Structures are given as C-alpha cells and as structure tokens.
C-alpha cells in the first residue's frame, strides 16, 4: 500500500510484536488448586476429565477424585450500634419484657417499632450481654 511503502522505505522502524505462541499457551489463573493440578499439555476437556469436573453441561457435539475431595474439603471450612444499644437498654429498664406496653411507649418507641422487631432486638441485646 501507499502507507506501507513508507514504513519499509524509512528508518523509523516497524513496531514489531510477537504474541502468537502465547495465544495457545494460556495460563490457568482462576484457581490455584486447579493450577497445581492443571496440565497445559492436555486440552481443556481432557484436563477437566482428568481433574474430575464436567467440562460441558450440554451434550458434547460430535464424538468424545482426590482433586475433587481436596477442593470440596476446603469449601466446608455483626453487632449493635452504640445508640441502638442505649435505646434497647432504656427500653429494658423502663418496660422490661412488657412488649404489650413497650409497643405503645411514645417516649421510647419513637419510631413505633413493631412488637416482633422490639423483641428480636431485645433478645439480641440480651444475648450480647447475658
């Protein structure tokens, strides 16, 4: 081409690049356990079969445990704010466990919290303080 001629007719130099090899050799990155067992020599389907995990959920077009246990094993292996705690302490001191009366406490139940919410918060506070 007209422009390609100049790139070769001038000493500017082509911005040479080489990445074809890396296009095929791709490093497994999403899991260290798989990386310790992955083998780039085998294909993705072959590697999945060797590891023990299904490569494809759908039927494969055309023709065709220790690692899982190690991966599976590792799979099996909140508080209250200062103002909220003070409000709950005030409620307990004033009405105690009398939820029926605490629900109507305008002085303390400013937001008119329901009986269930009040009892749940009081139980949380009691568990956090015995």
């Amino acid at each position: 081409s007209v422009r390609k001629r100049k790139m070769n007719r001038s000493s500017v130099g082509k911005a040479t690049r080489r990445n074809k090899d890396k296009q095929r050799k791709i490093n497994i990155q999403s899991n260290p356990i798989i990386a310790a067992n992955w083998d780039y020599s085998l294909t993705m389907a072959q590697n999945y079969k060797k590891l023990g995990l299904r490569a494809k959920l759908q039927t494969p077009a055309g023709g065709k445990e220790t690692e899982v246990v190690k991966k599976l094993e590792e799979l099996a292996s909140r508080s209250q704010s200062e103002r909220e705690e003070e409000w709950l302490e005030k409620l307990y001191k004033k009405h105690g466990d009398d939820y029926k009366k605490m629900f109507f406490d305008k002085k303390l139940n400013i937001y008119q919290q329901s009986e269930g919410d009040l009892k749940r918060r009081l139980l949380r506070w009691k568990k956090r303080n015995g």
Binding site: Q23, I28, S30, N31, M44, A55
Partner: protein, 118 residues
C-alpha cells in the same frame, strides 16, 4: 441462471474454515481458563419442539420457567448465579416436560458444589 447480477463482486471463499476452528478452540480454552471452576455453558432445559414434523424429537431449551425453578427448591434470581438458565417468557404446558425439567434441576443441584464467599 441466477447470475445476471455482479455476483463476482461478492464471492467469499471460506478459507477461514481451517483457521476458524482453531480460533474457536482457542476462545474456548481462554473461557475455560477464566471460567475454570464453572462449566463453559449453562444448564439448559429439555424441551419438546413444535412443527409435528419435528415434535417427535426431544431437544434442549433456552431456560427454565419460573414455575420450574420454584418447584426445584430455589429462586430464579438465585438460580442465575448457579448457572441455570431461566426463561421468563416460557410457559409450561406439558406435564412430562415439567417433570423432566424438575428432575434435571434436582440432579444439577445435587451434583453442584458452591465455594464460600471467602
């Protein structure tokens, strides 16, 4: 014949076929590397086709209906994160298809393991 036009101006010989397969394989390998823990494709439902000339053949579907997901013991929003396709515009009519989809969802749930958020 059907050549009165300037057909010669548009003749794409599929020489890329040989390289297209390799490119697709490389893309699949890249997806596997990125999606290593999970399968390259989502769990698709089994469905029956219309057009009786083909209805006798059982084939896969796009995504499970909301009713199927509910009967499978999970929710559509949660099922998506597990790789189960959900179709909000598909309505189940045949009972056998619904039962097969429910069984497939149950098998998938039993066969899957989810990593902790840690």
């Amino acid at each position: 014949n059907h050549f009165r036009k300037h057909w010669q101006e548009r003749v794409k010989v599929h020489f890329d076929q040989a390289g297209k397969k390799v490119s697709r394989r490389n893309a699949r390998a890249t997806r596997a590397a990125k999606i290593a823990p999970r399968p390259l494709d989502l769990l698709r439902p089994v469905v029956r086709a219309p057009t009786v000339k083909y209805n006798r053949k059982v084939r896969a579907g796009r995504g499970f209906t909301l009713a199927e997901v509910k009967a499978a013991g999970l929710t559509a929003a949660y099922a998506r994160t597990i790789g189960i396709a959900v179709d909000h515009r598909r309505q189940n009519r045949n009972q056998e298809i619904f039962d097969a989809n429910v069984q497939r969802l149950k098998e998938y749930q039993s066969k899957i393991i989810v990593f902790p958020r840690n």
